[PDB]
């Protein structure tokens, strides 16, 4: 019993964290085999951030301008290349702690664990989601750039995020491990702001099924809804549209509890209308949207 | 910016998790040097000395990854079983066994069949239970804090109570709370809110840019304690005030000035507003957790 925001064990990722220094800038890198991956803005000064020309800054650097430190050992850089917004630093030592891994690009609504690092040293691990506006609500300070997001399935680490910047509202933006940003963001000091954020509807439904599995049904009602009527109501509360794919994905949770997806949509409509009236659901007074249907199935019991 | 329920990096602890099997019971063990520590209920009104004396070393199957460890000795210390093994753990980190006090937080590495599945942060409640997330097979999962390179093990999971909350021991086998390790009528006592932690979280909200709850008022410690007792909040002591000193200095808000804000939040509610994305007053961040997360301390 119980339901917590659970992160994956971070050990496999801790063994890949290194410190990367170029001139006066120091941030984190990910060392997998003989390549260190890090944000390309490690080659910039603060002045450069307004309108940086990365190709022009990069061509002026040599391998020995990049200092890479793994624990107390200096790694030697023997090559460098840029792929989108990430710099790939070829080193002459392969990481003996390289786990089984994949680079995966995630979609909004997906969750992942973040190993927050400073100076190539991990300081904490937390769970979060790719918001519909492509930002993440992380906890990062200066020097955290290059920290990574991941999931672990079986013995395989799937790296999905690399941290690059903090937006004016305090939320965070970054890239996949191929250097492509999530969202319309640029690694440039420009007037860019997070779009209006919305609630991840399929995740709120998954968390309502998690509450039913754990023994709570006070929020259910005798009504149902069509998918179209549910979306017309949901959009009024800044909730993301629920698609037939989302309905399909909730199938197993609907079967385990005996509550149809459109019947759970009717409870959600009524919770949006009424609020919780002094009650909590799984120890929360707000509707939680950072647990996917997959996260609920992995954490919750198979019985009830 | 941002404020999350953050756990310590679990790697140093992952390298110690093993699976322990005795008869039909399988749970988790902690392998440090040549000893595996696990709940003594793995051998199960139980008479544990009588139950233990009937077992031999080969009755305990200990598995570290895909390798079987050979048990060469066994002894009981309170509610913890210590299994001497033939191989010392080459991944044993620098460690201490520490007993924590209610209100203190720690990270839990939840494991099943000696394999870690997740990490989360939690606090020892004033009623000595933890609000964890555990299923059958999670017994032997451990709680810890990390300071520099040293892992301080403070908790070992033993059982789930009827309300869905959890009970366990320190690594010397002494239970936290008035709990015993057997099937009997056991219930968590009435819980209270950890006041010093709510104040620390209110300082964290101010550091992150939220000040709507601040007011011009102050309070005495006695008047604040008379109000707090009415709302099932733990008494705030002069030690708690002292411990909040650094957060008070960083924000410029006196501890009794923050107590005046908390009194108004308890007497009036939030009025449709939130603090750090929460509509409830959060009590599972200590003053030290707030300082560490708002300063970037690494391990
Ligand atoms: C909160 O201040 C804003 C303004 N800056 S900054 O430090 O001047 N800045 C500008 C900038 C522009 C583009 C890119 Cl790709 C990166 C960067 C850097 C950046 O974003 N670094 C940070 C990342 N995460 C978290 C942070 C937390 C605090 C402070 C820097 C944090 C530096 C972040
Ligand atoms: C929730 O059911 C109650 C009744 N049982 S039980 O499974 O029969 N039970 C009895 C018992 C008595 C003493 C001790 Cl020290 C341990 C144990 C075990 C226990 O507590 N193990 C569990 C721990 N955490 C989480 C769980 C989740 C589900 C189910 C067992 C979970 C098993 C717990
Ligand atoms: Cl995805």
Give domain limits for chain A: 1-14+100-197, 15-99, 198-301
Residue B18: strand pairing partners: B29
Q: Which residues, 6+ apart, have CB-to-CB distance to A237 below 8 Å?
A: A199, A272
**Which chain B residues are Cβ-neighbours of A171 within 8 angstroms?**
2
What are the b/e assignments for A42-73, b being 16+ CB within 10 Å? bbbeeebeeebebeebeeeeeeeebebbbeee
Q: Decide the pairing of beta strands A25-32 and A17-22.
A: antiparallel
Geometric angle at alpha carbon A71, from A69 and A74, rounded to 5°: 35
Question: CA A211 to CA A300: how far, in whole Å?
Answer: 9
Residues of A with CB below 8 A from B12's CB? 11
Reported CATH class of domain B1-14+94-191: mainly beta
Query: Locate tokens 């998954």: which residue?
Result: A206
> Tokens 């199938």 label which residue?
A251
H-type helices in chain B, by residue range? 11-14, 48-53, 195-207, 221-230, 238-243, 245-251, 255-268, 287-293
Nearest Cα residue in chain B from A296: B133
- Residue A58, CA distances (Å) to A41, A52, A91, B38 in order: 10, 11, 17, 55
Show the beta-strand stretches assigned E in chain A. 17-22, 25-32, 35-39, 66-70, 73-75, 77-83, 86-91, 100-103, 111-118, 121-129, 148-153, 156-166, 172-175
Contacts of B44 (CB under 8 A, 6+ apart): B25, B51, B182
Distance CA A154, CA B291 (A): 35
Cβ-proximal residues to A155 (8 Å cutoff; 6+ apart), any chain: A99, A100
Atom of ligand 2 nearest to the CA of B181: 15
Residue A140 and residue B1: Cβ atoms within 8 Å?
Answer: yes
Closest residue by Cα to residue A231 from A277, A199, A274, A260? A199
Chain B CA closest to residue A142 = B296
Distances in Å between the Cα of A105 and the Cα atoms of A130, A176, A181, A285, B96 are: 11, 6, 10, 32, 40
CA A226 to each of CA A88, A241, B254: distance values in angstroms, whole numbers, following the listed order: 50, 13, 54
Identify whether the C-beta of residue A133 lies closer than 8 Å to the C-beta of residue A198: yes
Domain A1-14+100-197, classified CATH 2.40.10.10, yes or no: yes
Q: Whose CA is nearest to atom 29 of ligand 2?
A: B136
What is the CATH superfamily name and number for domain B192-295? main proteinase (3clpro) structure, domain 3 (1.10.1840.10)
- Beta carbons of B293 and A124 less than 8 Å apart: yes
Task: For residue A145, report the distance from its CA to the centre of ligand 1, in Å.
Answer: 8
**B146 in Cβ contact with B8 (< 8 Å):** yes
Q: How many angstroms is it from B294 CA to the middle of ligand 1? A: 15
**HSE, side-chain direction, 13 A CA sphere, residue B175:** 15
B41 has catalytic annotation: yes
CB B62 within 8 A of CB B83: yes
Instruction: Measure the CA–CA gap between B44 and B24, rounded to whole angstroms.
Output: 9
Look up the CATH number of domain B15-93: 2.40.10.10
Task: Give the residue among A141, A100, A150, A97 at the shortest CA–CA distance from A123.
Answer: A141
Residue B43 CA to residue B36 CA, distance in Å, equals: 14
Q: What is the dihedral of CA A186, A187, A188, A194, to 10 degrees?
A: 50
> CATH assignment of A198-301?
1.10.1840.10
**CA diameter of chain B:** 69
Whole-number Å distance between alpha carbons of A268 and A212: 13
d(CA B44, CA B22): 9
Q: Is the CB of A146 inside a 6 Å radius of any atom of ligand 1?
A: no
Indicate which atom in ligand 1 lies nearest the CA of residue A188. 13
- The size of chain A, in residues, is 304
Short-list B144, B132, B129, CA closest to B98: B144
- CA torsion through residues B285, B287, B289, B294, sign: positive
A1-14+100-197 and A15-99 have identical folds: yes
DSSP A54: H
Parallel, antiparallel or unpaired: strands B142-147 and A25-32: unpaired
Strands B150-160 and A77-83: unpaired
B139 is known as an active-site residue: yes
CATH class belonging to A15-99: mainly beta
Q: Which residues pair with A65 in a beta bridge?
A: none
Q: Where are the alpha helices (DSSP H) in A31-138?
A: 54-59
With beta carbons under 8 A apart, name residues in chain B contacting A281.
Answer: none
Task: Sort residue B128 into left (φ over 0), alpha (ψ -120 to 50) or beta.
Answer: left
**Hunting for tokens 């070992």 — which residue is that?**
B156
Q: How many CB atoms lie within 10 A of CB B91?
A: 14
- The single residue of B16, B41, B79, B240 carrying the catalytic annotation is B41
Distance CA B218, CA B239 (A): 19
DSSP B24: T
- Dihedral over alpha carbons B224, B230, B236, B237 (to 10 degrees): 90
Residues A304 and A213 sit within 8 Å (Cβ to Cβ): yes
For the annotated catalytic residues of A, the residue numbers are 41, 145
Neighbours of A155 (CB within 10 A): 10
Q: How far is the CA of B55 from the centre of ligand 2 (A)?
A: 23
Residue with CA nearest ligand 1 atom 32:
A165
Output the CA torsion sign for A197, A191, A135, B282.
negative
Tell me the β-bridge partners of A127: A113
CA angle A33, A128, A88 (to 5 degrees): 25
Rounded CA gap, A242 and B127, in Å? Answer: 42
User: What tokens does A70 get?
Assistant: 């793994």
Cβ contacts of residue A233 below 8 Å, gap of 6+?
A225, A269, A272
């Amino acid at each position: 019993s119980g339901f917590r925001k659970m992160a994956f064990p971070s050990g496999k990722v801790e063994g890949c964290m290194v410190q990367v220094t170029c001139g006066t800038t120091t941030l984190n890198g990910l060392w997998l085999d003989d390549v260190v991956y890090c944000p390309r803005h490690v080659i910039c000064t603060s002045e450069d951030m307004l309108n940086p020309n990365y190709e022009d800054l990069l061509i002026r650097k040599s391998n020995h301008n990049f200092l890479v430190q793994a624990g107390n050992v200096q790694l030697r850089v023997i090559g460098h290349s840029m792929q989108n917004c990430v710099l790939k630093l070829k080193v002459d030592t392969a990481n003996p702690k390289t786990p089984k891994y994949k680079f995966v690009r995630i979609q909004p609504g997906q969750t992942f664990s973040v190993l927050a690092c400073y100076n190539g040293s991990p300081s904490g691990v937390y769970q979060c989601a790719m918001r519909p506006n492509f930002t993440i609500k992380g906890s990062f300070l200066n020097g955290s750039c290059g920290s990574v997001g991941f999931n672990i399935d079986y013995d395989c680490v799937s790296f999905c995020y690399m941290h690059h910047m903090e937006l004016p509202t305090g939320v965070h933006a970054g890239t996949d491990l191929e250097g492509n940003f999530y969202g319309p963001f640029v690694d440039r000091q420009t007037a860019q702001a997070a779009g209006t954020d919305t609630t991840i509807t399929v995740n709120v439904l998954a968390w309502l099924y998690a509450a039913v599995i754990n023994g709570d049904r006070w929020f259910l009602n005798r009504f149902t809804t069509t998918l179209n009527d549910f979306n017309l109501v949901a959009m009024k509360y800044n909730y993301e549209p629920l698609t037939q794919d989302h309905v399909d994905i909730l199938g197993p949770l609907s079967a385990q509890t005996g509550i149809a997806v459109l019947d759970m949509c009717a409870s959600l409509k009524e919770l949006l209308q009424n609020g919780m009236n002094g009650r909590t659901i799984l120890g929360s007074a707000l509707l939680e949207d950072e647990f996917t249907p997959f996260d609920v199935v992995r954490q919750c019991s198979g019985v009830t």
